[PDB]
C-alpha cells in the first residue's frame, strides 16, 4: 500500500537511531563501570596497604 511508503523509511531511520543508541549507550555504561570500578579500587588499595 501507499502507507507502506513510510514502512521501509520510518523503521529504517528508527533502526539507524537504534544502532546510534547502541553506540552511545553500550559505551556509556562502559563509562559508568569504568568510572566506578576505578573509583572503588583506590580506597580498597589504601586499606590493603594500610593494614601493614
Amino acid at each position: 500500500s501507499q502507507k507502506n511508503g513510510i514502512a521501509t523509511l520510518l523503521q529504517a531511520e528508527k533502526e539507524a537511531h537504534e544502532i546510534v543508541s547502541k553506540a552511545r549507550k553500550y559505551r556509556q555504561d562502559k563509562l559508568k563501570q569504568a568510572k566506578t570500578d576505578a573509583a572503588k579500587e583506590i580506597d580498597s588499595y589504601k586499606i590493603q596497604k594500610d593494614k601493614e
Binding site: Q2, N4, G5, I6, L9, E13
Partner: peptide
C-alpha cells in the same frame, strides 16, 4: 505518493523515458 534523505523534482515528458 511514495513507495534530504530522498530526491524530489519534475521533468518534461520529452525525457521521462530516457
Amino acid at each position: 505518493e511514495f513507495f534530504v534523505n530522498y530526491v524530489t523534482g519534475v521533468i518534461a515528458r520529452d525525457k521521462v523515458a530516457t
